[PDB]
């Protein structure tokens, strides 16, 4: 089953322009990831991970995230925050497994890997499994909005990955395998 292209890729995407990779037509036997990648985090909120080999899946989607350290705990059902409210929202009956791992050796530069952006501002809320790519200038007042400068802001802000940051600022790659058993 195709996971080498996903879980051993070249490059991933920013949080606001997340992929929805489609995986289909195979038998879920992910023991290879246990040896290839020593997963520090592994949370399955549905059925037991050991019993996951009992049933196969058809319409599972996966996502490509590069987020901070003290941010992965926000990727959980019923949580709140900037990322949960503005980039990626999970359902209450979320049936899948979240997997993350450190990626310092391939996602950092001395000057800075300024290639990952994240949404910070919005005059609205999000809905589960929504993707937005809007780059329109954001209004903060009553006055008409014309470019950046005064209160109008560009609703995209970048990260600052450097090799000598602490654990809470180094990137963890999160691939949310939300395989719903009833729809698969």
């Amino acid at each position: 089953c195709p996971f080498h292209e996903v879980f051993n890729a070249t490059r991933f995407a920013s949080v606001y322009a997340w992929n929805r990779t489609r995986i289909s037509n195979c038998v879920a036997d992910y023991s290879v990831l246990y040896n290839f990648a020593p997963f520090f985090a592994f949370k399955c909120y549905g059925v037991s991970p050991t019993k996951l080999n009992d049933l196969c899946f058809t319409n599972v989607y996966a996502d490509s995230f590069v987020i901070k350290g003290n941010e992965v705990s926000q990727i959980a059902p019923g949580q709140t925050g900037n990322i949960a409210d503005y980039n990626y929202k999970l359902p209450d009956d979320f049936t899948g497994c979240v997997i993350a791992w450190n990626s310092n050796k391939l996602d950092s530069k001395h000057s800075g890997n300024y290639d990952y952006w994240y949404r910070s501002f919005r005059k609205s809320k999000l809905k589960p499994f929504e993707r937005d790519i809007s780059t329109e200038i954001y209004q903060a007042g009553n006055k008409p909005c014309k470019g950046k400068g005064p209160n109008c802001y560009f609703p995209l802000q970048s990260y600052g990955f450097r090799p000598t940051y602490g654990v809470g600022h180094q990137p963890y790659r999160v691939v949310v395998l939300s395989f719903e058993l009833l729809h698969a």
């Binding site: 910070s120 903060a140 007042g141 009553n142 209160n151 000598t164 940051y165 809470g168």
Partner: protein
Amino acid sequence: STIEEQAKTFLDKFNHEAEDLFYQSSLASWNYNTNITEENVQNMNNAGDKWSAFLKEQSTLAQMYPLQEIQNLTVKLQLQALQQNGSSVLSEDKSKRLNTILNTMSTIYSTGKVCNPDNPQECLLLEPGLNEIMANSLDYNERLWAWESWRSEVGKQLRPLYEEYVVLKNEMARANHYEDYGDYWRGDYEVNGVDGYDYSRGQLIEDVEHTFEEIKPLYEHLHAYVRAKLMNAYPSYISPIGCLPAHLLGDMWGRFWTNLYSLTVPFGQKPNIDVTDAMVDQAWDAQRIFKEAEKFFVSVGLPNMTQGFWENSMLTDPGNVQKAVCHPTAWDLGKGDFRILMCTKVTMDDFLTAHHEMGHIQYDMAYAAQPFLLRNGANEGFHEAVGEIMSLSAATPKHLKSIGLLSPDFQEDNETEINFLLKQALTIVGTLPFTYMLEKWRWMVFKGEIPKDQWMKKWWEMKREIVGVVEPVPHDETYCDPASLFHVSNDYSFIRYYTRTLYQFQFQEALCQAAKHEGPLHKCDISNSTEAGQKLFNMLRLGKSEPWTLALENVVGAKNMNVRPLLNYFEPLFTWLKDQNKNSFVGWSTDWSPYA
């Protein structure tokens, strides 16, 4: 479309920009401090220019929101910090003159040297030089010669510049809608807002006066003992009942009295505690010292050190290959980067400095969750105090005896305790009057109560009334004595030290009492106590998010400065001083002057 939301969004943008900018500035400063190179200086200058320009630009955008419409008590402090005109109140020529005079004063103080008379080829700088003469010489005439000289060439050449410095500083202070520049410094302790926890700017002066009015008898007894002891070294140069001349105190200005330990030791037969030999016999390096400090800190429930801390921080001087400035420092670069910079050799003093700096690092690590503008101490005194409480706790004989660095049969007697108390006293208690006097003089000058032609007439009387020191030679209006100090030539406050000294003993007493200690305070160890660790942590992790009164109440239990622990820590020393000087003269009089 309300205003508080717009202010909040501006704060959100500022927090994200400032983090990266400040990280770059700190990293450049660290790299420059480790090495020495001209292009590194250029890079540091460029980074500082970028940081300053970013701060100045971001200040302008914050002026749109008036402060009076805010009901949050949390964003208010951030906006108040950001909304302050840094140096934009003045005109361009005013700023040019101010920067010119400040740099001129700094350079003049930096490059001061003195030449011995009739020897044009023999000149000495201030440091090294006059410091060695003051600190390790028993001669008499040379000390007087240097004391007269340095002041004579420095004060007369720096007074006129200081006049314009004072004038411009007062002009700026009045421009920023304050009373005077002394009010500008007093404003750091100001907390206004929440009911029950108000602290006006004018209350600090009265608090300082009332608190100092209590330790004066102990200082009197200690000063009488010192004067009695000095009769053996200067038989024919000390007045029997007068004040101690300032030229025989072991320092250029008289800040500390530490250099008198070997001359006023109570029982000199038994030497003090020094654990060097056991340190050498086990082949100790910096790694063992730092891991022992880590073990001590984790013993009370505090977290450990970060994994990167053991890797990115240098512990010993590399040698001749590189060239750094050896001065202990704990660096808070942000974003989970904490490092310690110190040139280490196996000695007890460095073993204590390690604890001091690691406590500093733990305090930095405590408040990492607060916003950027709130990541500092409650005021300008908590930081070194939290540093020093650990040092006081870790150097007691009981702690050294327990950890296996001393003989398991080591009999502690009641004979070394007097020596230890006197050694601590000569460096802690003997400095408070000096700080109090200097701050009083500076505030009186800024307010203006002392006319320009009557400065010395009050300056030398304050010395006699507070520190008990009398000038050895007559002086005229040409001299400018106070400007010779490091913190006077440079723009720096001085009231931090009094607050630190008062706070540290209060913290120590609270932790010892909550730690189930038996006996006098001087034999206390804060080890093995989660009770004293949780209490401290409830203050460590607040940061600047709460008024300092509430932060103090979570540890001490009282919301005001207290002086009882400072007198409690010296109960047996006070008893011995009372016993010893029953047959001597008490107090000092302004009657004897060496020149008359």
